[PDB]
Structure formats: C-alpha cells, structure tokens
C-alpha cells in the first residue's frame, strides 16, 4: 500500500508542477510597493496577572476577550479601556478563547480537554467534553454550533444546545494547533504539528485538500478575506501563502535574519498586509503581495502569543506573555 | 457612568486575586509511569510551614509533549521523579531529564530530582553502563545510588550555569520527609531568584 501512496503522491506533485506556470512574485513586479508602515500603540490594557495565552475580537469591532494563565477571562471595552467582564475559570491552563458573533456567548478551554461555554446574557452555560487531548482552538459558527480542534489529532463540530459531537474530522497525524473559518462559514482549514494544513468541509465532514510545503510544526493559521487563500505560520521562522483553487503554495514570507517561529498570523481588511507575531518579542507586517517586510511592531517585553485584526480593520490587538495587551493603529 | 464603576469593581477584585495568587507556589510533577510519582490533570494542594504548594500532574494527553509543556513556563519548579531501581529504563529517564533541562522555554526552571524506590535498588545491588567500572564514590554522606546521582548531575551542570539548579534527593517508598525537602528547595530557589534580581542578572 505504501508504493501506491507514493505513486499518488508523485502524481499529485507532477500535477501541481504542471499547473504552476508563473509565480506570484513575477506578477507582483510592476505594482507600487506599500510604503513604510509605522503603526503606533493607541491603547494598552492592563489587569492580567500572568501571561496572556489567546484573545479574540468581537464582531462589533469594539469589545474583545482575553484569557490569561491566572485562570482569568477578561472582556475589555477597547475604546475606553474600561473592563466589562471578568470570568474565573475552573482550570488555570487555558490555551484558547472565542467570542460569539452575536456577542452573547464566550468559549474557552485548555489542558482539561473541556470546551467551556459561558453565557453573557456570567454563569457557565455548557461544558463540551468529548476530546482526549488538550483543546487548542475553538471558533464559533453560531450560537448553537461550534468548531473545536484538539491535541488528539482531531477536530470536531459540536451542537451546543445538546452537548454532543455532531461531527468529527480525522486525518491529521499530529496535534492540531490552530484553525480558521472561511467567511462563507461552510469550509475551514486546520494546521497541525505535522507541517501540513488541511481543508475541511463542515457539512460533508471530509477533508478536501491537504497543503504541505512547510518544514516544522504550524502554530497559527488565518484565512484570506476573499476566501480563496490562507496564510500559515510555523516554527521554521517562515510564513506561507497557499491558494485554494491552485492547491499550491504561492509565496513565502521570511528573511535571513529571523531564527524564531511564528505564534500568530492575521491579514488586513483588504488582505494587502499580513501581520505575523513572532517569538522574538515583536511582530512583523509583510506586504502580502510583494513579500517584502513593510514594517515592524515593537514594544512587548515577551513573546507575542496572540494577534488579531478588528473586523473593520481599524486596529490590531496583540497579546504577549508580558501580561499586557496592546492595540495598534 | 456605570461602566467606570464596574471597571473599578473589577479592578478591586483583580487586586484581591493578585494578592491571593502571589502567595501560592505552583509545581509541576513529572516522571515515568514506573516511577512512583503518586506516592510522593491531578492537582494536589498541601501546606508546609504556612506556605501553600499546588502540584499539578498531567497525565490526560498523549505522549507528544513538546507543545503543552510550554504552558508550564512560569512554574516554580519541576519535581522530577526517577525510578532508580530499573536499570533498563534509566537511559530513557536521562534523556527526558536532558530534554527538560535544555529546553528553551524551561531553561529557567529548577528541577527537584527525586530518586524513588531506593530500597529496591539496595536489594537489587546485594546479589548497561560500562562507565560504572571505572568509578569511585565521592567523599559524601552515607555506590550505585551516588553513581546515578552523578549521572544526572553531569547533564545538570553540562549546560545552563547560573540560570537554574538541580537538587537531587534519595527517597524511599515510605519516606515522609518529601514535603520538607520540597519546601527547602523552593526556599533556595526563591533566594536564588532574589539574588539574580539584586545583581540585575
């Protein structure tokens, strides 16, 4: 069976090579480059006693949520810096958090293999407990459905009102670290500790395509605004842009001065800029088309753990291990 | 405005939470399955001389532990339990200790090393490593046990000098002085952290 697998792998590689006639860099040679982008810190949010592990912007572009090591899930009002909510967790090993699109529910989870869902109307409303490994990322499809990825090499689609695993996605050979939902909310992607990202159909429940060009574990993933591409960041100090229709890697964002992996990846509203949070205590803003570093965001005393971009693209929120969350404009 | 009042109340609650959080010492318990880590996620909270210790033992995830270990970066110490009786699996424990010591995110965490089941080792010695033949016991208190201790200390002092320390201990299955040793090691770790801060290291 191994020989057949190698045969289809060679056929896939040959088809991909034949399909690729030009390169993105060659096409993006006659366009004007983005000028030196210098984004300044407008707000800083304090109150977390320990390192911040994840964050998620609200769909109203104003409120956000952040989870820290001290077992605290704090919901901030970004505009006035005033704190809105503070939820204590049963376990202080939270690795991810999420904000419901309607703004009524907030989910988190971690080393306890439990996806806790709190109702903001703050009492815990549901505990989804079906995973075998740590839960690494959870995203909200609706107030009744959620998609999670665990460290047991599986993803899941849960129905919240019942508490059961409606669908399970298998195929990863390593711990799944991050996932991103397409804007159509019908397809999504998952990056694992396997140097391979995969595309899952939510309704069908079967993997459509697998993109493997990386060299080490993938720590973060984000989806292009138009829904036909996505960028992944890994531990080999590189970011990569993959295209859905061509099913091949398009551009590689890296410089010969970085020896640290990427812990967070996000796009701008128009997709022209790609923001990558690094373990070197700073973030980099790349030109997503010219593959040239257009700017650097510095000011964190520890590694940037989470990075997000506002829905309307008016701000970028970065949370690092320095127990501080900074908003850049 | 009521929002500012709510923010002030939450800030006071967070100050109280910081006050309680800073007084609890968190420890991570690691070791192989054969090593008697239980006898020394399951969370065990104990109290030594009015000091609160909280030890977490993680055994619910898979064997790939290069990703969830990073969640224990700010832990006070790693209590590493080694079954010194079993010679066959000793090299596996040595590899685990070396990987823990040389890790980038755990390069500033001290290791309290317990060498469990000394009675079994003593029984086995009285009626794998070729280097044991050309070995002599040091001028310490009261040969195989000290050889294993030196084998661990070789890796301990091979790298990371001045950043963290390894504290060996010889523990039996019915030894009740483990809490005192953990408290003393934590006290020395706090003293070292204070010294490093005071010299701007």
């Amino acid at each position, epitope marked *: 069976l191994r020989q057949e697998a190698e045969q289809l792998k060679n056929q896939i590689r040959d088809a991909r090579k034949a399909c690729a006639d030009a390169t993105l860099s060659q096409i993006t040679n006659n366009i004007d480059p983005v000028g030196r982008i210098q984004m300044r810190t407008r707000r800083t949010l304090r109150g977390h006693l320990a390192k911040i592990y994840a964050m998620h912007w609200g769909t109203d572009s104003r409120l956000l949520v952040s989870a820290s090591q001290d077992g605290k899930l704090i919901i901030w009002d970004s505009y006035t810096t005033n704190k809105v909510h503070a939820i204590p967790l049963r376990s202080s090993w939270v690795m991810t958090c999420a904000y419901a699109p309607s703004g009524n529910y907030v989910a988190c989870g971690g080393l306890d293999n439990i996806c806790s869902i709190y109702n903001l109307k703050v009492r815990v409303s549901r505990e989804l407990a079906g995973h075998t490994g740590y839960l690494s990322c959870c995203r909200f499809l609706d107030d009744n459905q959620i998609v999670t990825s665990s460290g047991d090499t599986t993803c899941a689609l849960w129905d919240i009102e019942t508490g059961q695993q409606t669908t399970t996605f298998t195929g990863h050979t390593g711990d799944v670290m991050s996932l991103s939902l397409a804007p159509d909310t019908r397809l999504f992607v998952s990056g694992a500790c396997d140097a391979s990202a995969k595309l899952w159909d939510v309704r069908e429940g079967m993997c459509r395509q697998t993109f493997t060009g990386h060299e080490s574990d993938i720590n973060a993933i984000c989806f292009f605004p138009n829904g036909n591409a996505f960028a992944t960041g890994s531990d080999d100090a590189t970011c990569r842009l993959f295209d859905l229709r061509a099913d091949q890697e398009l551009m590689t964002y890296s410089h010969d001065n970085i020896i640290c992996g990427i812990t967070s990846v996000s796009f701008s509203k128009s997709g022209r800029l790609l923001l990558a949070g690094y373990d070197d205590f700073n973030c980099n803003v790349w030109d997503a088309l010219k593959a040239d570093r257009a700017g650097v965001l510095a000011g964190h005393d520890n590694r940037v753990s989470c990075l997000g971009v506002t829905d309307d693209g008016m701000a970028v929120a970065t949370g690092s291990w320095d127990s501080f969350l900074k908003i850049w404009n | 405005k009521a929002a500012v009042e709510r923010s002030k109340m939450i800030e006071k609650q967070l100050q109280k939470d910081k006050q309680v959080y800073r007084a609890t010492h968190r420890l991570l318990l690691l070791g192989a399955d054969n090593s008697g880590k239980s006898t020394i996620i399951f969370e065990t909270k104990f109290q030594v001389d009015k000091v609160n210790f909280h030890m977490f033992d993680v055994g619910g995830q898979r064997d*790939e532990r*290069r990703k969830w270990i990073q969640c224990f970066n700010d832990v006070t110490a790693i209590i590493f339990v080694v079954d010194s009786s079993d010679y066959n699996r000793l*090299q*596996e424990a040595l590899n685990d200790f070396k990987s823990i010591w040389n890790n*980038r995110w755990l390069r500033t965490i001290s290791v309290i090393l317990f060498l469990n089941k000394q009675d079994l080792l003593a029984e086995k010695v009285l009626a794998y490593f070729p280097e044991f033949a050309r070995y002599t016991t040091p001028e310490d208190a009261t040969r195989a046990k000290y050889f294993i201790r030196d084998e661990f200390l070789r890796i301990s002092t091979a790298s990371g000098d001045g950043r963290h320390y390894c504290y060996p201990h010889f523990t039996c299955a019915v030894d009740t002085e483990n809490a005192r040793r953990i408290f003393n090691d934590c006290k020395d770790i706090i003293l070292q952290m204070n010294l490093r801060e005071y010299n701007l290291v």
Partner: nanobody
Amino acid sequence: QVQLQESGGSLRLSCAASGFTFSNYKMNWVRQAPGKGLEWVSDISQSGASISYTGSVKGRFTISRDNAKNTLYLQMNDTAVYYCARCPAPFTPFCFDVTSTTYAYRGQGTQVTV
C-alpha cells in the same frame, strides 16, 4: 514534504533527507526492538559537534552526517527496526518527542537482524 528515506540492512545504515534544509536540525538514530517500545540509540548535532550514544552502544557505533549530500550515516559493528528522526524545530539543541509512538518527522526505518 518532509521525507526521510532509510536504507541498509557490520552495517552502514543510511538516511536521505528531502523537503527541508538538512544542515539546520539536530538528528537522532532510533531503534525499536521486536516486542518492545521505541528506544533512542544515537544523536548528532547540526555541525558534527558533541555526539551522544546510549550506554550499550558507546564506542561500538559511529554516526556521521554529510550536509553537502544531505544524508545521515550510522556505521555499526541487536536485531531491531531502525529509524532516522529529526528535531521538531531548527536552531535548537534539544529533541523532545523523538521517541514517540507517532512522530510526524520520522522515517520508515529498516530491519536489521543479527
């Protein structure tokens, strides 16, 4: 695609690597004896620096790496299935999950019978 193809099976076991920059990772040779679990055997750094061997093979085995040809050699002179494994991340002097049941960056391995 991270590919590690092993060959061979005194012996001169070889491991050819492709899909990544070879001279950037710390490599290990691992074995699995029949009826037992995975056991680490040998380890070499990324530049021919300090080399580690398990207690039972010290001196008796040799391990080299040809960075120009992107290959890893293990010269031996027990019966087991051998694999060549890579450190998960580059520029790092430690391998964490090499001796694991399911490792993503480990080759197929070759049988050696004595």
